[PDB]
Amino acid sequence: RGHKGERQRGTRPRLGFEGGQTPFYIRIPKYGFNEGHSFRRQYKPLSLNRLQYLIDLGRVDPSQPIDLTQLVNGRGVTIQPLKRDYGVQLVEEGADTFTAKVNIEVQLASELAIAAIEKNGGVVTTAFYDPRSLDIVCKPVPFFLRGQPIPKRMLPPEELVPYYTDAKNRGYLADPAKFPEARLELARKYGYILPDITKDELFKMLCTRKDPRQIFFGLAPGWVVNMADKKILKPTDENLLKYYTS
Amino acid sequence: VKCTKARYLKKKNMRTLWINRITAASQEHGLKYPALIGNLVKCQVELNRKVLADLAIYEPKTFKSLAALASRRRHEGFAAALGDGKEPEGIFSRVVQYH
Amino acid sequence: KFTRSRIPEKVFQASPEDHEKYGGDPQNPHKLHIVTRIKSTRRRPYWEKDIIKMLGLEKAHTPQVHKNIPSVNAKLKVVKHLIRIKPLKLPQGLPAEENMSNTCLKSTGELVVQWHLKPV
Amino acid sequence: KNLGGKSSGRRQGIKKMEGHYVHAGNIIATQRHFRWHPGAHVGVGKNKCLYALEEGIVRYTKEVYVPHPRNTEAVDLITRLPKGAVLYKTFVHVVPAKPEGTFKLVAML
RNA sequence: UCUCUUACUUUUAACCAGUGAAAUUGACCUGCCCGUGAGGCGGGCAUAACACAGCAAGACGAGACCCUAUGGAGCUUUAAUUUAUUAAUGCAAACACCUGCAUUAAAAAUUUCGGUUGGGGCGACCUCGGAGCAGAACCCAACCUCCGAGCAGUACAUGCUAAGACUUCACCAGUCAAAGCGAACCUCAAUUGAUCCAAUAACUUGACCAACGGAACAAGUUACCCUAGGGUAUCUACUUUAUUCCUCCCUGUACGAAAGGACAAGAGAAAUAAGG
RNA sequence: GCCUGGUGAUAGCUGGUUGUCCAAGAUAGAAUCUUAGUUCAACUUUAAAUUUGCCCACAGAACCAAAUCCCCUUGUAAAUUUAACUGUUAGUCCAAAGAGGAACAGCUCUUUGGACACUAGGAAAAAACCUUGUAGAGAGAGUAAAAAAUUUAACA
RNA sequence: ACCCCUAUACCUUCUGAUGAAUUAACUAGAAAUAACUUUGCAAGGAGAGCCAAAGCUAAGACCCCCGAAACCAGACGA
Numbered sequence A: 001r002g003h004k005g006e007r008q009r010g011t012r013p014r015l016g017f018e019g020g021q022t023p024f025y026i027r028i029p030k031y032g033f034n035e036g037h038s039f040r041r042q043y044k045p046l047s048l049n050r051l052q053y054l055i056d057l058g059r060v061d062p063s064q065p066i067d068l069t070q071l072v073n074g075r076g077v078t079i080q081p082l083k084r085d086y087g088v089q090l091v092e093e094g095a096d097t098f099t100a101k102v103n104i105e106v107q108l109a110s111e112l113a114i115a116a117i118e119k120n121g122g123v124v125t126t127a128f129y130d131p132r133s134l135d136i137v138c139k140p141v142p143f144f145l146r147g148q149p150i151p152k153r154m155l156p157p158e159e160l161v162p163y164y165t166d167a168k169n170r171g172y173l174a175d176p177a178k179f180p181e182a183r184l185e186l187a188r189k190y191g192y193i194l195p196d197i198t199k200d201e202l203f204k205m206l207c208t209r210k211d212p213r214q215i216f217f218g219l220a221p222g223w224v225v226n227m228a229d230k231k232i233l234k235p236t237d238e239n240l241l242k243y244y245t246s
Numbered sequence B: 001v002k003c004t005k006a007r008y009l010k011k012k013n014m015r016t017l018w019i020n021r022i023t024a025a026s027q028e029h030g031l032k033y034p035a036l037i038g039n040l041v042k043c044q045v046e047l048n049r050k051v052l053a054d055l056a057i058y059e060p061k062t063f064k065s066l067a068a069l070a071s072r073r074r075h076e077g078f079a080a081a082l083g084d085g086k087e088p089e090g091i092f093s094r095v096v097q098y099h
Numbered sequence C: 001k002f003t004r005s006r007i008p009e010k011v012f013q014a015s016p017e018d019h020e021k022y023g024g025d026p027q028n029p030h031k032l033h034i035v036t037r038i039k040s041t042r043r044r045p046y047w048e049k050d051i052i053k054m055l056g057l058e059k060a061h062t063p064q065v066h067k068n069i070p071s072v073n074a075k076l077k078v079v080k081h082l083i084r085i086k087p088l089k090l091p092q093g094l095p096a097e098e099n100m101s102n103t104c105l106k107s108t109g110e111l112v113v114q115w116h117l118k119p120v
Numbered sequence D: 001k002n003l004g005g006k007s008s009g010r011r012q013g014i015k016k017m018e019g020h021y022v023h024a025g026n027i028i029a030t031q032r033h034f035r036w037h038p039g040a041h042v043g044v045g046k047n048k049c050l051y052a053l054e055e056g057i058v059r060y061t062k063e064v065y066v067p068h069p070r071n072t073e074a075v076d077l078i079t080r081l082p083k084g085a086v087l088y089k090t091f092v093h094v095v096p097a098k099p100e101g102t103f104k105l106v107a108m109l
Numbered sequence E: 001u002c003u004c005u006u007a008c009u010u011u012u013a014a015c016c017a018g019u020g021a022a023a024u025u026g027a028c029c030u031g032c033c034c035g036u037g038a039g040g041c042g043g044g045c046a047u048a049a050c051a052c053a054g055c056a057a058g059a060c061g062a063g064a065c066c067c068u069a070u071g072g073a074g075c076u077u078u079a080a081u082u083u084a085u086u087a088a089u090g091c092a093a094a095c096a097c098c099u100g101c102a103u104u105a106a107a108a109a110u111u112u113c114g115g116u117u118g119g120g121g122c123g124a125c126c127u128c129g130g131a132g133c134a135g136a137a138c139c140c141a142a143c144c145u146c147c148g149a150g151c152a153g154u155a156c157a158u159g160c161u162a163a164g165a166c167u168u169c170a171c172c173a174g175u176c177a178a179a180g181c182g183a184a185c186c187u188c189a190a191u192u193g194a195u196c197c198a199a200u201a202a203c204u205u206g207a208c209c210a211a212c213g214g215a216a217c218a219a220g221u222u223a224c225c226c227u228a229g230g231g232u233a234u235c236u237a238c239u240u241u242a243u244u245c246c247u248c249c250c251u252g253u254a255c256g257a258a259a260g261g262a263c264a265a266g267a268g269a270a271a272u273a274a275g276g
Numbered sequence F: 001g002c003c004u005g006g007u008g009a010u011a012g013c014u015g016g017u018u019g020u021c022c023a024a025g026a027u028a029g030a031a032u033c034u035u036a037g038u039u040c041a042a043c044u045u046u047a048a049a050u051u052u053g054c055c056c057a058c059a060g061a062a063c064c065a066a067a068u069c070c071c072c073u074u075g076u077a078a079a080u081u082u083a084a085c086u087g088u089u090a091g092u093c094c095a096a097a098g099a100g101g102a103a104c105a106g107c108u109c110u111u112u113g114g115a116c117a118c119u120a121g122g123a124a125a126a127a128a129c130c131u132u133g134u135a136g137a138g139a140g141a142g143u144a145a146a147a148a149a150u151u152u153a154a155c156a
Numbered sequence G: 001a002c003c004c005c006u007a008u009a010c011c012u013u014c015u016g017a018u019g020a021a022u023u024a025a026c027u028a029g030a031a032a033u034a035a036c037u038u039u040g041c042a043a044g045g046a047g048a049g050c051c052a053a054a055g056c057u058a059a060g061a062c063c064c065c066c067g068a069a070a071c072c073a074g075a076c077g078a
Ligand SMILES: [Mg+2]
Pocket: B012, B015
């Protein structure tokens, strides 16, 4: 401890105290770097290098739709709904050398990543998930042990409705009548001839979307999955059906 | 602590004890101590103080002959450094060169 | 203030009297110095302590060979009060690889390359 | 009754002595009055500080001082001099190291 | 009481017998003189060992005085902050008391009383710059020596950006700046103030916060102060080592020349000290 | 008042901090209701990465003494950066340059360098003067510093 | 055995007075953010939550004792 002072006695002052002059961490103006930090939305990146990597090693099956559950179960992307991740964003890294016909549902996507998927005969759409809904999507099995009926996912807030209703970034609430113009525009911009998805055999697979207010793929809101004896209990009351099919 | 600092003083006090005994024994033959030690070095007799003190006590004829060799060398030092210039060196004054 | 001392150049210019005193020739001078520390670096400034460490004279009464070039002479001029300098004279040649082990530097300043322990 | 005088040292003087390589914009020397003047490839700030305008090596010289004709102080100091009297000052130069670019082959059209 | 003390009795004492504490205590085989910085260190000197009784020169042992604490407590206020408490008013509520909200008083309550200082106080000061100290890269103190500053003036591209640097010995702050875009075709040394908070639609603005790295707002005093700190003898040593005044004589001679005027030695009488 | 509790009150202040052995290791400062203290720096320590560090030669650094900066060679072996932290600071004295004071002080304040807070020898004793450093045993040897020197006055 | 020679008690506080008669027993370094070392697994680690542009998991390894005047609440006391 050294010689007898205040640091030997055990009573050195708090961290940051500069002995009486105004401390470093207080001489400096407050600025809002971290002002609304816990309400900003976060999106884990998934590069196309990463997703080609998952498709090559059998971890993500591209002959099925790639929802967010399939990226979690292949352990391609770890997303945590606390710490307010709102899902995955596709990332243009590895756009050259991306050779996969795929159907991904990713909450944000850059133009060049949409171009790299849609070049190869792919489909991208950008869905939205509530924190509740996203949390049920990522780890679905600890939700079906919770006993609750499947809820309906909520529509975006007003900041994000102009995002998911645009056909340029492939919104899930946008027209399916404005999509060929946008696919045609990217195909003209980045110099590839736009293949028609209608011709090949995976088309019925490459067309499937779940509508808004549907969290899982083949299921519906209001159903109660009985994991134990492998059943699905469905409600038949009219008030519940007005509430769940809203 | 005294026990370890006394190693230095053991060596020191033995040496002054030997110089006292060589001094006494060489004063018996008229020499002084600096004369004896100097003019035995100058004869290439490199005996040390312990041995000279022990010869002084136990072998006083060898010690008398060493005092005779040292006083003879001392006089050749005198006579050599008196008649200066090129001359024959002293008999006991000669050195044995080692190569 | 106590400072580092420059020494003028007239101090290091020999006179023919000095060539009569010591054994030197101004033409054909000696190549190697023998330097020995004969005084302590304690109570001396830190720069002299350093120069003693550079010249390799940390132990006293131990000879060290140096070159007689102006750089080494500059360092020697800084600590010339702590050392002793003599010319390395070589009566026989510098030692070949045959005579490399059997040498001895004598007190005179000469380095003999055949060191028996027999009398002549 | 002597208050004041507690000001510290300005830490001025030469930052780059002669021979030193210098990049563009390095402050060569800060002075309080013109001890050194800007020579070739050396600029001056509002604080009379000499900085460098090219990359090269700093050199100090002694040159003839001929002030600007609109500088009535130094010009009035000139005309009082006798007929041989010529003022000198010490200047600082940066001798530029690099060439300012090379021609390189780009395409065989 | 004293000159100046003396005698005796009792007690105490000392010895013998019984009983039997305490403060104290680094270890001690515990000398003197000088010197150093003194039982112990240096130079000298001294020196068989051991009780018992004394003495009190030394060894070893509270009460003051000053300063300090971002330590307390008390007292006085025109220190600061309150009015919770009372007492009055006023207004509401209600049809004087009571309740609510203000306001003025008394009674108090809470908290404080910065720093520098050849111990402290008075005085003076507390930040920034120039010069000397500090002669020649940088830096360098003092209740050291001398000057100053807390602005003014001009311009409104005193626009925006940006390589590279300097930097008051940290940090914070400070400075310089090419190229570029846009245009034309700052002087001075210092000339100053963080954060939070306010004011403002915004751009911006806000302290002699001068104790000048600034606590959002707190005085005097205490010899009543208080606390924490800083400046009955154990040992050594010791306990039986003839002056002066006056008188007288020599002599009122010596000496001087008159005035003057001896010594010495002797007798006296005193006084003190020493020993009886 | 006194007792119990809050209460292990608080104390930048005093006092105290328990096996062994080795190693590396001491003196710029800036702020502060601050000078009995802390924070940053400087110095110190370990680990790591790398590449230079130290000594230095010419040349060079302003007008109104001693030296220093800069610096290739050379002699050496360190330095910087990265990571992680503690601790230390009114130092004292001597030599030198000065300031205040009485050209007093074991007085006060700066600067440069030593030494001391690290060993041993010497100087009477002896922190700081001189010699000397790196650790053990030896009944060997060579050395270093190292001992104060003085004695007087006739006159033509 | 002593005599000879050498040798200014220990702690602590200062750049260089304090406390201790003596013995026995009792009596004072408590935290794993980050870094480091060692494993595991590794674009993933972790037995949910958390981190991840070689990381993550686990462990090891760092933070004292005594001492006021006081203040407040409730009792007990003439
Ligand atoms: Mg010896």
